[PDB]
Write a protein that binds this ligand. Structure first.
Ligand SMILES: C=CCn1cc(C(=O)N(C)C2CCN([C@@H](C)c3ccccc3)CC2)c2cc(C)[nH]c2c1=O
Ligand SMILES: C=CCn1cc(C(=O)N(C)C2CCN([C@@H](C)c3ccccc3)CC2)c2cc(C)[nH]c2c1=O
Ligand SMILES: C=CCn1cc(C(=O)N(C)C2CCN([C@@H](C)c3ccccc3)CC2)c2cc(C)[nH]c2c1=O
Ligand SMILES: C=CCn1cc(C(=O)N(C)C2CCN([C@@H](C)c3ccccc3)CC2)c2cc(C)[nH]c2c1=O
Lengths: 102, 102, 101, 101
C-alpha cells in the first residue's frame, strides 16, 4: 500500500482510543484560559485529518511532526503531572503501535 | 478543494512570493522602532499559518480580515511612499490571484 | 556535483515509508540505555544538519554516517527486530538512490 | 529570478567588513566543542552551495539559513561577544541587500 492509506489507518486507530476525546478538535479557550496566548502552534486530530485528506502530507515526516506538536502542546499547557498528560502518553503509545502496524 | 485546503494552498503561494520575507514573522521592534506602540493589531504570515493549522479559521472571511490587517499595519507604519508598501501591494495582488485559483 | 547528489539522496531516504524511526536522534525512553550501548549515534536529521553545514567533504564521509545509522539499529535491536526489517528496507532504497543520483 | 536576487545579496554580504568569520564552516580549533554545542551549523559558503545547487526554491529557506547562522553565533559566543557585534552588523547588511535586490 501507500503513505496516505497508512496515515489514514493510523488516525482512525488513534481517534478510536479511549483517551483521544481531548485531542479530537481545536482547544476551546473557554475550557483552557489563554491557551492560544501560551501555545504558539496549536494541533489536533481534526486538523491532521484535514491536512491528510487535503493531500498536504507528502511523507510521514510532516504527519509525525504534527502529532509531536499536539503532544508537546498538551505537556506545555497542562504540565507533566496533569491528567491530560497521562492521556497524551497513552495516545502517543497508541500512535506508535499503529505506525508499526500500518 | 475545502476552505482549509484552499487557505493552506494560498499561504504557501504567498510565502513563496519574492516580497513575502518582511511579512513572514512578527515584526522585530529593533528594525521598526515603537512598532508595537503604533500598531494595535499586529499580524504576520507565521501567525496566520498557526491560526489555520490550529483550526481557528471557520471561514475565509476570518482569514481575509487578518490579511487586511497585515497590509493595513504596513501602510500605517511605513507610509504610502515606503519600499515596504510597494512590497505589501505586490503581496496583496499575490494573495488575490491565489484566492481566485484555490 | 557531490553536494546536490547527497541532498537528493537524503530526500529519497526521508520519503520512504519506513524512515520515520530514523528521522530524529533516538529517544532513550523508547530505547533503554541506547546511548550507553551505541557509541556513535546517527539519524537522518543529524546528517541533514552536517550536509547543510558543509561538514561532508566526501560522498564517502556521508555514506559512512548512513552505514553507521543501519549498523547501530542492528547492534541495538538485534537481527530479528521489526526495526531491523525497516532498516533493511531503508538501506536498499538508499543504495538504489545513490545509483540513480 | 529569486536566484539572481539571492546571489546579489550573498555577494554584498561576503563584501562586508565583518563577514570573514562567517565565510566558511567554524574551525573547532578556534572554537572548542563548537559542533557539540551547535546542532545546526550554517555559514556563507554552505548557503552559496545550496543557492548554486538549486536548493533554495524561495527566499524563505534562504532567510531561515541566515537566521540559523546568526542564532548559532549568539548561542555559542554570548550576547556580549565581539563576534555577536559582527553578527549584528552582518544581519543589518543582509537586510539592506534584501530590500535592494
Ligand atoms: C489534551 C489535549 C488538549 N486539550 C484539550 C482540552 C479540551 O478541549 N477539552 C478537555 C474538551 C473541551 C470540550 N470538548 C467538546 C468538543 C466536548 C466533546 C464531548 C463532550 C463534551 C465536550 C472536548 C475537549 C483541554 C482543556 C484543558 C483545561 N486543557 C486542555 C487541553 O490541553
Ligand atoms: C530504528 C532505528 C532507530 N530507533 C528508533 C527508535 C525510536 O526512537 N522510535 C521507534 C520512536 C520514538 C518516538 N518518536 C515519536 C515522535 C513518535 C512517532 C510516532 C508515533 C509516536 C511517537 C518516533 C520514533 C527506537 C526504539 C527502540 C526500542 N529502538 C529504536 C531504534 O533503534
Ligand atoms: C562568528 C561566526 C562563526 N564563528 C567563527 C569562528 C571562526 O571560525 N573564526 C573566527 C575564524 C577561524 C579561522 N578562519 C581563517 C580562514 C582565518 C582568517 C583570518 C585569519 C586567520 C585565520 C576564519 C574564521 C569563531 C571563533 C569563535 C571563538 N567563535 C566563532 C564563531 O562563532
Ligand atoms: C513589512 C511589514 C512589517 N514590517 C516588518 C519589518 C521587519 O521586521 N523586517 C523588514 C525584517 C527584520 C528582520 N528579519 C530577519 C529574519 C532578516 C531577514 C532578512 C535579512 C535580514 C534579517 C526579517 C524582517 C519592518 C522594518 C521596518 C522599518 N518596517 C517594518 C514593517 O513594517
Amino acid at each position: 500500500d501507500d503513505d496516505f492509506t497508512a496515515m489514514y489507518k493510523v488516525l482512525d486507530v488513534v481517534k478510536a482510543h479511549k483517551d483521544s476525546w481531548p485531542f479530537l478538535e481545536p482547544v476551546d479557550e473557554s475550557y483552557a484560559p489563554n491557551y492560544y496566548q501560551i501555545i504558539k502552534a496549536p494541533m489536533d486530530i481534526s486538523s491532521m485529518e484535514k491536512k491528510l485528506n487535503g493531500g498536504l502530507y507528502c511523507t510521514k515526516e510532516e504527519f509525525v511532526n504534527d502529532m509531536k506538536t499536539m503532544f508537546r502542546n498538551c505537556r506545555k499547557y497542562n504540565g507533566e503531572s496533569s491528567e491530560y498528560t497521562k492521556m497524551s502518553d497513552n495516545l502517543e503509545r497508541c500512535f506508535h503501535r499503529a505506525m508499526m502496524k500500518h
